[PDB]
Amino acid sequence: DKTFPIMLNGQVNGYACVVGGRVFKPLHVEGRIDNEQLAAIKLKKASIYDLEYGDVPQCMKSDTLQYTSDKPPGFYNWHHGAVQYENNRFTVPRGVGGKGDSGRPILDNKGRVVAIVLGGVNEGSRTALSVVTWNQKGVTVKDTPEGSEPW
Amino acid sequence: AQHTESFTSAISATAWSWIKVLVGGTSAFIVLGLIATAVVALVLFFHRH
């Protein structure tokens, strides 16, 4: 996958994901993307649904495909491990869930992105992730568990 | 003058219709958007679950 991070004062505090046609970036992080082609894009602020602008030209579109409907609750891919929940997100162990790990996509077994993490630092022995997804008909929803600090 | 002058002495029927349309024009447009603001908040609440 291709996921350009976000630089601020030398450290990495967020990640920017690219889906087919559009470029994603979390609102909670501040900084400049390392891709100079992506810096000229006029990203616009929006509501909690995290709408940005895919103003990239034709030569590199459709990097990955967003996952469609008919979601099973089985195995799913993740950068730091695996998640196995559809209605919620899985209770992943420690290590993942620190700081500056926002914007990392959650992929399927065919390489299709299903969700993008935004929060849920630590909730005890079981950590829940606050992600965005599509509920039933492709309409973008935002699911947030209780006590989900911005992560 | 034998009579007395009041506040609504000079207001005619055609002039009173204009100030009740212009008042009603603002009240029609305000409640049009105020209903439509809460309509999409109901769909956005129902979109999640």
CSV table of C-alpha atoms in Angstrom, one decimal:
chain,number,residue,atom,x,y,z
A,1,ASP,CA,0.0,0.0,0.0
A,2,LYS,CA,0.9,3.7,-0.5
A,3,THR,CA,0.4,5.8,2.6
A,4,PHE,CA,2.2,9.1,2.9
A,5,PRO,CA,2.7,10.3,6.5
A,6,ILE,CA,2.4,13.9,7.8
A,7,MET,CA,5.5,15.7,9.1
A,8,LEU,CA,5.5,18.4,11.8
A,9,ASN,CA,8.8,19.6,13.4
A,10,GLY,CA,10.7,16.5,12.3
A,11,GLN,CA,8.4,13.9,14.0
A,12,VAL,CA,5.5,12.0,12.5
A,13,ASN,CA,2.2,12.7,14.1
A,14,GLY,CA,-0.3,11.4,11.5
A,15,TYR,CA,-0.8,9.5,8.3
A,16,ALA,CA,-2.6,10.4,5.1
A,17,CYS,CA,-4.3,7.6,3.1
A,18,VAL,CA,-5.1,7.5,-0.6
A,19,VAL,CA,-8.2,5.7,-2.0
A,20,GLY,CA,-9.5,5.6,-5.5
A,21,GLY,CA,-9.8,9.1,-6.7
A,22,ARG,CA,-9.6,10.9,-3.4
A,23,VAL,CA,-7.0,11.7,-0.7
A,24,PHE,CA,-7.7,11.3,3.0
A,25,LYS,CA,-6.3,13.3,5.9
A,26,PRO,CA,-7.4,13.5,9.6
A,27,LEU,CA,-8.5,16.9,10.9
A,28,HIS,CA,-7.0,16.4,14.3
A,29,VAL,CA,-3.4,16.5,13.0
A,30,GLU,CA,-1.6,19.6,11.7
A,31,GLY,CA,1.3,19.4,9.3
A,32,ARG,CA,2.4,19.1,5.7
A,33,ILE,CA,2.4,15.9,3.7
A,34,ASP,CA,5.8,14.7,2.4
A,35,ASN,CA,4.4,14.4,-1.2
A,36,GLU,CA,5.0,17.7,-2.9
A,37,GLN,CA,2.3,16.8,-5.4
A,38,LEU,CA,-0.2,16.4,-2.5
A,39,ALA,CA,0.8,19.8,-1.0
A,40,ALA,CA,-0.8,21.7,-3.9
A,41,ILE,CA,-4.1,20.0,-3.4
A,42,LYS,CA,-6.8,22.3,-1.9
A,43,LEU,CA,-7.9,20.2,1.1
A,44,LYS,CA,-11.1,21.6,2.6
A,45,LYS,CA,-12.4,21.3,6.1
A,46,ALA,CA,-15.7,19.6,6.8
A,47,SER,CA,-17.8,17.8,9.4
A,48,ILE,CA,-17.0,14.5,11.3
A,49,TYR,CA,-17.3,12.5,8.1
A,50,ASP,CA,-13.8,13.8,7.1
A,51,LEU,CA,-14.4,15.1,3.6
A,52,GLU,CA,-11.2,16.2,1.7
A,53,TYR,CA,-10.4,16.8,-2.0
A,54,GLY,CA,-9.0,14.4,-4.5
A,55,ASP,CA,-7.5,17.0,-6.9
A,56,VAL,CA,-4.7,14.6,-8.1
A,57,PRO,CA,-4.2,14.3,-11.9
A,58,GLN,CA,-4.9,11.2,-14.0
A,59,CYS,CA,-1.4,9.5,-13.9
A,60,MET,CA,-1.7,7.8,-10.5
A,61,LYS,CA,-5.4,7.5,-9.6
A,62,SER,CA,-7.0,4.3,-8.1
A,63,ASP,CA,-4.2,3.2,-5.8
A,64,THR,CA,-6.6,1.0,-3.8
A,65,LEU,CA,-10.3,0.3,-3.9
A,66,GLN,CA,-12.6,1.0,-0.9
A,67,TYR,CA,-14.5,-2.0,0.4
A,68,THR,CA,-18.1,-2.4,-0.7
A,69,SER,CA,-21.1,-3.8,1.2
A,70,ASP,CA,-21.9,-7.3,2.5
A,71,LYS,CA,-19.4,-7.1,5.3
A,72,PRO,CA,-18.5,-10.4,7.1
A,73,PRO,CA,-17.2,-10.4,10.7
A,74,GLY,CA,-14.2,-12.6,10.0
A,75,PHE,CA,-10.5,-11.8,9.5
A,76,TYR,CA,-9.2,-8.4,8.5
A,77,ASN,CA,-5.8,-7.0,7.8
A,78,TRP,CA,-4.1,-4.2,9.8
A,79,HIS,CA,-0.6,-2.6,9.7
A,80,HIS,CA,0.3,-3.5,13.3
A,81,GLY,CA,-1.7,-6.8,13.5
A,82,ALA,CA,-5.2,-8.1,12.8
A,83,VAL,CA,-8.8,-7.0,13.6
A,84,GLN,CA,-11.8,-9.4,13.6
A,85,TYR,CA,-14.9,-7.3,14.2
A,86,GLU,CA,-17.4,-5.7,11.8
A,87,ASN,CA,-19.9,-3.8,14.1
A,88,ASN,CA,-17.1,-2.7,16.4
A,89,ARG,CA,-13.3,-2.9,16.2
A,90,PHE,CA,-11.2,-5.7,17.7
A,91,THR,CA,-9.5,-5.5,21.1
A,92,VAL,CA,-6.0,-5.3,19.7
A,93,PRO,CA,-3.1,-5.7,22.2
A,94,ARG,CA,-0.7,-2.9,23.4
A,95,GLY,CA,2.0,-1.4,21.4
A,96,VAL,CA,-0.5,-0.2,18.9
A,97,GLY,CA,-2.6,2.6,20.4
A,98,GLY,CA,0.0,5.1,21.4
A,99,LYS,CA,0.3,8.6,19.8
A,100,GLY,CA,0.6,9.8,16.2
A,101,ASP,CA,-0.9,6.6,14.7
A,102,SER,CA,-4.0,8.2,13.2
A,103,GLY,CA,-5.0,7.9,9.5
A,104,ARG,CA,-3.7,4.3,9.1
A,105,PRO,CA,-6.2,2.4,6.9
A,106,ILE,CA,-7.6,-1.0,7.7
A,107,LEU,CA,-7.5,-3.4,4.7
A,108,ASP,CA,-9.3,-6.6,3.8
A,109,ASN,CA,-8.0,-9.9,2.5
A,110,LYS,CA,-8.2,-8.7,-1.1
A,111,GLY,CA,-6.3,-5.4,-0.3
A,112,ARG,CA,-9.5,-3.3,0.0
A,113,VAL,CA,-9.6,-0.6,2.6
A,114,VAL,CA,-12.5,-0.9,5.0
A,115,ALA,CA,-11.9,1.7,7.8
A,116,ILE,CA,-9.6,4.5,8.9
A,117,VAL,CA,-8.6,4.8,12.6
A,118,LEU,CA,-9.1,8.1,14.5
A,119,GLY,CA,-9.0,7.4,18.2
A,120,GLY,CA,-9.3,5.0,21.1
A,121,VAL,CA,-5.9,5.2,22.8
A,122,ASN,CA,-6.5,2.7,25.6
A,123,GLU,CA,-9.6,1.4,27.4
A,124,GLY,CA,-8.1,-1.0,29.8
A,125,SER,CA,-7.3,-4.6,28.8
A,126,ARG,CA,-9.6,-4.2,25.8
A,127,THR,CA,-8.9,-1.3,23.4
A,128,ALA,CA,-11.6,-0.1,21.0
A,129,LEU,CA,-10.8,1.9,17.9
A,130,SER,CA,-13.0,4.8,16.8
A,131,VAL,CA,-13.1,4.5,13.0
A,132,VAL,CA,-15.2,5.6,10.0
A,133,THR,CA,-16.9,3.1,7.7
A,134,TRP,CA,-20.0,2.6,5.6
A,135,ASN,CA,-23.0,1.0,7.4
A,136,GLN,CA,-25.3,-0.6,4.8
A,137,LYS,CA,-25.5,1.2,1.5
A,138,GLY,CA,-22.2,3.0,1.2
A,139,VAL,CA,-23.2,6.0,3.2
A,140,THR,CA,-20.2,7.2,5.2
A,141,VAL,CA,-20.8,6.8,9.0
A,142,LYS,CA,-18.6,7.5,12.0
A,143,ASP,CA,-18.6,5.0,14.9
A,144,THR,CA,-17.1,6.1,18.2
A,145,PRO,CA,-17.0,4.1,21.4
A,146,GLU,CA,-17.1,5.6,24.9
A,147,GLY,CA,-14.0,7.3,26.1
A,148,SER,CA,-12.3,7.6,22.8
A,149,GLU,CA,-9.6,10.2,23.0
A,150,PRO,CA,-8.0,11.4,19.7
A,151,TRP,CA,-5.3,8.9,18.8
B,1,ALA,CA,-59.3,70.1,15.8
B,2,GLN,CA,-62.3,68.6,17.4
B,3,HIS,CA,-60.9,65.0,17.1
B,4,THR,CA,-57.7,63.4,18.5
B,5,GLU,CA,-54.8,61.9,16.6
B,6,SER,CA,-53.5,58.4,17.4
B,7,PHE,CA,-50.5,56.3,16.3
B,8,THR,CA,-52.4,54.3,13.7
B,9,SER,CA,-54.4,57.2,12.3
B,10,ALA,CA,-52.6,57.5,8.9
B,11,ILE,CA,-52.2,53.7,8.2
B,12,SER,CA,-54.4,52.6,5.3
B,13,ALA,CA,-55.6,49.1,4.4
B,14,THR,CA,-53.2,48.9,1.4
B,15,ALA,CA,-50.3,50.1,3.5
B,16,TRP,CA,-51.1,47.6,6.3
B,17,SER,CA,-51.1,44.8,3.8
B,18,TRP,CA,-47.5,45.6,2.8
B,19,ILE,CA,-46.1,45.6,6.3
B,20,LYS,CA,-47.8,42.2,7.0
B,21,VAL,CA,-46.4,40.7,3.8
B,22,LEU,CA,-42.8,41.9,4.4
B,23,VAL,CA,-43.1,40.6,8.0
B,24,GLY,CA,-44.5,37.3,6.7
B,25,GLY,CA,-41.8,37.1,4.0
B,26,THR,CA,-39.1,37.0,6.6
B,27,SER,CA,-41.0,34.5,8.8
B,28,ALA,CA,-41.6,32.2,5.8
B,29,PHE,CA,-37.9,32.0,4.9
B,30,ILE,CA,-36.6,31.6,8.5
B,31,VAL,CA,-38.8,28.6,9.3
B,32,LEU,CA,-38.0,27.1,5.9
B,33,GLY,CA,-34.3,26.8,6.7
B,34,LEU,CA,-34.8,26.1,10.4
B,35,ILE,CA,-37.0,23.0,9.6
B,36,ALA,CA,-34.5,22.0,6.9
B,37,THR,CA,-31.6,22.3,9.3
B,38,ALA,CA,-33.2,19.8,11.7
B,39,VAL,CA,-34.3,17.6,8.9
B,40,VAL,CA,-30.8,16.6,7.8
B,41,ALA,CA,-29.8,16.2,11.5
B,42,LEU,CA,-32.5,13.5,11.8
B,43,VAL,CA,-31.1,11.7,8.7
B,44,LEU,CA,-27.5,12.0,9.9
B,45,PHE,CA,-28.7,10.6,13.3
B,46,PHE,CA,-30.5,7.8,11.5
B,47,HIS,CA,-27.6,7.1,9.1
B,48,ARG,CA,-25.4,5.7,11.9
B,49,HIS,CA,-28.0,3.3,13.3
